[PDB]
Amino acid sequence: DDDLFEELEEQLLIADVGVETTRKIITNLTEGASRKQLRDAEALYGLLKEEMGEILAKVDEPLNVEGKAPFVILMVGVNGVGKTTTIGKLARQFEQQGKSVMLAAGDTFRAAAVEQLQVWGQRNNIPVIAQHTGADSASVIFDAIQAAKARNIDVLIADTAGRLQNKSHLMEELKKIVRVMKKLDVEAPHEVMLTIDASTGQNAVSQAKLFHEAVGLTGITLTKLDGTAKGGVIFSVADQFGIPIRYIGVGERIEDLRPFKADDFIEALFA
Amino acid sequence: NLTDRLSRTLRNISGRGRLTEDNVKDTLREVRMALLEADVALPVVREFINRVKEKAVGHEVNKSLTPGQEFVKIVRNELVAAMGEENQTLNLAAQPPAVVLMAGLQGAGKTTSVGKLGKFLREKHKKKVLVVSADVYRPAAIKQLETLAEQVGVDFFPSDVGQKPVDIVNAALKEAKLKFYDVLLVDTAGRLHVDEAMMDEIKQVHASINPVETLFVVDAMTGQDAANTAKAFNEALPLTGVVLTKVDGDARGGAALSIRHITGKPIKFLGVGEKTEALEPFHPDRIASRILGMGDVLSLIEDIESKVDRAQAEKLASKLKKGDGFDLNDFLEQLRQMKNMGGXXXXXXXXXXXXXXXXXXXXXXDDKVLVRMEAIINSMTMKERAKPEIIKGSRKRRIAAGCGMQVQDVNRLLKQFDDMQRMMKKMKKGGXXXXXXXXXXXXXXXXXXX
Ligand SMILES: Nc1nc2c(ncn2[C@@H]2O[C@H](COP(=O)(O)OP(=O)(O)O)[C@@H](O)[C@H]2O)c(=O)[nH]1
Ligand SMILES: Nc1nc2c(ncn2[C@@H]2O[C@H](COP(=O)(O)OP(=O)(O)O)[C@@H](O)[C@H]2O)c(=O)[nH]1
Ligand code: ALF
Ligand code: ALF
Ligand SMILES: [Mg+2]
Ligand SMILES: [Mg+2]
């Protein structure tokens, strides 16, 4: 039966789940299987999906942008996780049920980020507020919120520059952004989005750790799931930090944004 | 943690023997988990573990102090050897223009890498560089590459989303050949290995421009998917190297080891930052050195090891210099032992057959001669002693002037030293009994003294 242990272990390890979460899950699955005396494999798969389903049970909370004028969503994360694309998707996603959307460019560092979000804004036929490369981000986002309050915009999505968690000054910059955003509205931002790449390894734990210790992340978006990366580290960060998962990008297109579902994630995981 | 775990493991399992396969179990397991937390591909982990076993069978560990330390040394050596060599560079020798093709997933930092390599090749290598964007997909990617090219002072080839990558890179190559550009940098769209159309696209591009350099750009935080990506990209294109980005993060970066093992392609570049001016060469030892955190444990150990090293070095060198053969050092020792023990009156009695032929009073006084010899030797530097064949006329002048005597006496003592060296060499080559019995008294005829 050791071959089954090795097989399951390898299957959990290649999913970038982590050795700690693997140890916990395997232990609980062992106790559960020993308790229920399951002699079949399908029941083992089912019990596994039940345990991991319990792991993802807390984070299944959907995102509600209703009730606030505007509803500010802060998109944060490391470099190249596709935050801007996620914003481009969320624009139409929030445009669909009749909520008015305005976009704000918070990356003045990277080249042609403003132009990119202006392209995504043009695709959604919605106004985009930005100034120039090199400008203060907090000021732009602030003016964006003020304008959103004056223009009665329902939903305002605020982009941020790609930043590594090991850099403290950028964290202080983001904290400055939040602090500035606290002026117009005390509960702003209402939604803090952490965009995590599916290909990311155990480093995502540290990313989510520092970003939560800083901005107080209220949510996590897992993109690039159209590859062979299942992003099993999300189980670890959901275990430790208990942060909800808002959506999952299935591709680069504007229609590729889907609401996060536990069952579908499980189906895509083992497949 | 590595050193602590290995030391603990080797201590608790076995006492001091010579390390055997049975004792390396928990070691291999802890190293396995350490690499698993390092985001290293599991097959690479296993295949490395096998080599660790092969090195574990023949352990010389027993003679050292800390087994875990030297085991760490072995693992580090094997890992560095697995990472490849240093000074890995693109081939700019090539018949110009040199074409560099970029490949990787989405958000890999290929474009920023194009900017970095642009500035690097322009400033340092004094090369004329032309850059082009083959990406018609990502919004403002062409504008991004154009901006970076404008910042690094590198000419940019205009392109739009209404065109096709093939025609774009073909026109770029044609423009590079027409304007006599030294280096052609081709930036391409980030693509997934599961995408057929994009792979066929980059294959058609690679076939079109025939690049001398094909770089694979992968993130440092990449997980177990790095195996699939590296394998697929390696099978799809003949990679000439791998470019790792975002190394400045706190990420473990085992994906580098993964790709390096699977693809077999060396890493020629490490992105140290977001900015264009920030780039670093790949050092196997630096990357293989650190996945960890610790303190105060390694310092004392490295100190002790340094002490042992310098001690063994000096002690072996001292025996090596004295083991070269007979020199003026041993000649000096034999001369001072001579003048202290000098037996001229007694040695005249000790010798019998030589006294019957040669004159009885022909024996020279030991005191004067050997004091002269000692004092003249004292005028010589340590280098002229251990290496007597470098002595020349000017040195003889220095010696003679120092001792307050004539150069002919210096030449005389050098002659006597030559005789002593020859003799002792004959004593070392043969037997002391064959050589003592080979000593002959020269007589130029049977007439005495003639
Ligand atoms: N296939 C796929 N590609 C993605 C996804 N999210 C982002 N991308 C790609 O990532 C590229 C660059 O990401 P970007 O938005 O500039 O990163 P960021 O702005 O720093 O967050 C874009 O060209 C997208 O095509 C996803 O969920 N799936
Ligand atoms: N820290 C760091 N960031 C990087 C590096 N390379 C790229 N990036 C980040 O990646 C982001 C955009 O990636 P991009 O080049 O557009 O992706 P690609 O064009 O698909 O290869 C930028 O905002 C950079 O901050 C690197 O070596 N170090
Ligand atoms: F590429 Al980014 F923030 F847009 F790192
Ligand atoms: F984000 Al890219 F090629 F610039 F995938
Ligand atoms: Mg962006
Ligand atoms: Mg690009």
Curated annotation (Swiss-Prot), chain A:
It is a peripheral membrane protein. It is an enzyme of class 3 (hydrolase). It catalyses: GTP + H2O = GDP + phosphate + H(+). Disruption phenotype: Deletion affects both cell morphology and protein export. Mutants are defective in the insertion into the cytoplasmic membrane of three topologically distinct membrane proteins, MalF, AcrB and FtsQ. Its EC number is 3.6.5.4. One of its GO terms (cellular component) is cytoplasmic side of plasma membrane. Proteolytically cleaved. The cleavage may regulate function and subcellular location of FtsY. Full-length FtsY is found primarily associated with the membrane, while cleaved protein is predominantly present in the cytoplasm. GO terms for biological process: protein targeting; SRP-dependent cotranslational protein targeting to membrane; stringent response. Coiled coil: none annotated. It is found in: Cell inner membrane; Cytoplasm. Conformation of the Ffh-FtsY complex and regulation of its GTPase activity are modulated by the 4.5S RNA. Formation of the FfH-FtsY complex leads to a mutual stimulation of both GTPases. The keyword Cytoplasm applies. Keywords: Cell inner membrane, Cell membrane, Cytoplasm, GTP-binding, Hydrolase, Membrane, Nucleotide-binding, Receptor. Involved in targeting and insertion of nascent membrane proteins into the cytoplasmic membrane. Acts as a receptor for the complex formed by the signal recognition particle (SRP) and the ribosome-nascent chain (RNC). Interaction with SRP-RNC leads to the transfer of the RNC complex to the Sec translocase for insertion into the membrane, the hydrolysis of GTP by both Ffh and FtsY, and the dissociation of the SRP-FtsY complex into the individual components. Part of the signal recognition particle protein translocation system, which is composed of SRP and FtsY. SRP is a ribonucleoprotein composed of Ffh and a 4.5S RNA molecule. Binds to SecY. This is Signal recognition particle receptor FtsY.
Curated annotation (Swiss-Prot), chain B:
GO terms for molecular function: 7S RNA binding; ATP hydrolysis activity; GTP binding; GTPase activity. It is an enzyme of class 3 (hydrolase). It is found in: Cytoplasm. Its main location: cytoplasm. Keywords: Cytoplasm, GTP-binding, Hydrolase, Nucleotide-binding, Ribonucleoprotein, RNA-binding, Signal recognition particle. Conformation of the Ffh-FtsY complex and regulation of its GTPase activity are modulated by the 4.5S RNA. Formation of the FfH-FtsY complex leads to a mutual stimulation of both GTPases. The keyword Membrane does not apply. It holds the Pfam family SRP54. The keyword Cytoplasm applies. Its EC number is 3.6.5.4. CDD domains: SRP_G. Disulfide bonds: none annotated. One of its GO terms (biological process) is protein targeting to membrane. SUPFAM superfamilies: P-loop containing nucleoside triphosphate hydrolases, Signal peptide-binding domain. GTP binds at residues 104-111, 187-191, 245-248. InterPro entries: AAA+_ATPase, P-loop_NTPase, Signal_recog_part_SRP54_M_sf, Signal_recog_particl_SRP54_hlx, Signal_recog_particle_SRP54_M, SRP, SRP54, SRP54_GTPase_dom. It catalyses: GTP + H2O = GDP + phosphate + H(+). Disruption phenotype: Essential; deletion experiments lead to loss of inner membrane protein targeting. Also leads to reduced targeting of lipoproteins Lpp and BRP. One of its GO terms (cellular component) is ribonucleoprotein complex. Part of the signal recognition particle protein translocation system, which is composed of SRP and FtsY. SRP is a ribonucleoprotein composed of Ffh and a 4.5S RNA molecule. Metal ions are essential for the formation and stability of the SRP complex. Interacts with the ribosomes, via ribosomal protein L23. Interacts with FtsY. Belongs to the GTP-binding SRP family. SRP54 subfamily. Composed of three domains: the N-terminal N domain, which is responsible for interactions with the ribosome, the central G domain, which binds GTP, and the C-terminal M domain, which binds the RNA and the signal sequence of the RNC. Involved in targeting and insertion of nascent membrane proteins into the cytoplasmic membrane. Binds to the hydrophobic signal sequence of the ribosome-nascent chain (RNC) as it emerges from the ribosomes. The SRP-RNC complex is then targeted to the cytoplasmic membrane where it interacts with the SRP receptor FtsY. Interaction with FtsY leads to the transfer of the RNC complex to the Sec translocase for insertion into the membrane, the hydrolysis of GTP by both Ffh and FtsY, and the dissociation of the SRP-FtsY complex into the individual components. This is Signal recognition particle protein. The gene is ffh.
